[model samples]
Target: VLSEGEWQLVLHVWAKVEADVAGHGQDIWIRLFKSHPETLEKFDRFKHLKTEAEMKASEDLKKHGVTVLTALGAILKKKGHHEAELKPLAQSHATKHKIPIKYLEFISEAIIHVLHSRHPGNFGADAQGAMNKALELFRKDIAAKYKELGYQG
Candidate 1:
């Protein structure tokens, strides 16, 4: 999920402050959030867990992250990216939490209903396509986070 511009800016900012983001970047807490803290409760749970060096980098990114994520979602909407798939870690979290399969059976029910109710004709083809793409992006991002942490569920 690292953007070229954001990555460059992070590097530059870290360099200017004489800090190494490389080491700070290894924080698993940050990795978890970057993956999909947007979908979780207590998303800000790690705000103060960072070391000083990580704090500098994380604080700046935290301010911009929601904006960046919103813009990215907007771009997906514009491009008609429907991602209906679930992320690996998100799926894992569900399993880990012991949410019953029967309940999850209706997981995408809301999205499906919204598409039909709000944009009738836009349902089947293009709408589903966009939802699926969104799901895919989430999947990939969460998978990448798993790799970062050297764990998979």
Candidate 2:
């Protein structure tokens, strides 16, 4: 549940960054790997490509970053109202990667850090809180899928 102002802020910030989705998404994933190298183990194709350069250079990896940011863009455009749209993502992460819910926490932290670093005052507390809720909402839905499977991820 985001305030209207917070939704506006999200749209504004997303507008600023959407043009550079390739680069911005790349940064997010790169930061994720750098902060938690163990996450790479979840991606069978990516586990072997250890370096930032190697991952960034791969078209497959770049496409993956684009795909992730594209989904985020969809969620933002819907203002967090599109649960059905996000379910496939949840399914893939849970069943395919068996990704831990904790990784969402780490990724959320990295995203906030990147957002703050990219535009200092653009992301205020209210906006940050809204973003946190939105991300957490997604995380919850994703985790719920795992629970349904009896994995309790």
Candidate 3:
């Protein structure tokens, strides 16, 4: 759960960057694979990629990033209502996609890093904490769903 202040701060930053990130979701994915190279193996289309430059130019990564950004928009709009949004999303990943919960943590980290780097001087510590808390709340919901579905590691 996030405090009202944290939620407000998260909203403040998100409102400012939502449009900007719409076209640049790939930056977060790039950051994730930059920090955790092994994760690239999870995507067969992307697994063949070898370097950051290659990833930067990959149409596959661009298309997938757009897909993820749209999915995230749905999940974010649900706020904390897991059953209506997060639960089904988590279940699909757990079963069909076979995505591990640990990868959610990585994605959260990537999101924060993307925001921070994108804003540079504007992304302060308080805002960073709030965003991290918000993403952690999101991550925790999916993680709980994963556990309930017997997909825990």
Candidate 4:
């Protein structure tokens, strides 16, 4: 497992130089934070947030966050979203380093962060658990499709 420092290093490097999906990832994180007001606690709660209005705003932010990540993944998979432009370097790095694309790590982290952010106190745990269970089932379907496609280039 990568240490937090290692993850931060990878993210910072990608943030500084991996321009393709970098903005999309940022959008996803920021939007999720906004939609889930309670999510702010994930980052910091040292400063108290007052008012029901602020609370509502945070919830809105969290909703936007999940929407953004979904959009980003879709865009990344699409042909015209400059995906090709970004592919060569990532693929090259993957080849040279014998590493799976680093973006997978980023994507997974984004998903988890959004989940936790939206369910700050864990009241939403049951709902999130259900959502994750559904995803786990679907993941195998997707993986089967990938295998059928020969996990191709």
Candidate number of the best lDDT: 2
What's the lDDT for candidate 3?
Answer: 0.77
In model 2, where do residues sit more than 4 Å from their true spots? none
How well does candidate 4 match the true structure in TM-score terms? Answer: 0.32
Which wins on TM-score, candidate 1 or candidate 4? Answer: 4
83 Cα displacement, candidate 1 (Å): 16
Model 4 lDDT tens row, 41-132: 53343124454445344654445445544443443233223434334434443343232323334434455555455434542555445334
Q: Summing lDDT over every window of 10 consecutive residues in candidate 3, give the lowest-scoring window.
A: 73-82
Among residues 3 or more apart in sequence or in different chains, the pairs in candidate 3 whose N, CA or C atoms overlap within 3 Å are: none
Quantify all predictions' global Cα lDDT against the true fold: 0.40, 0.80, 0.77, 0.41
* lDDT (10s digit) by residue, model 3, range 70-127: 7776665555564677767887888877887688888888888888877755469998
TM, every model: 0.31, 0.89, 0.87, 0.32
Give stretches of model 3 more than 4 Å off.
Answer: none
Ranking the candidates on lDDT from highest down gives 2, 3, 4, 1
Better of 2 and 3 by lDDT: 2
User: Against the true structure, what is every candidate's RMSD?
Assistant: 14.7, 1.7, 1.9, 15.7
Q: What is the lDDT of residue 46 in candidate 4?
A: 18
**How many backbone clashes does every candidate have?**
14, 0, 0, 12
Residue 72: error of model 1 in Å? 6.7
Best by TM-score: 2
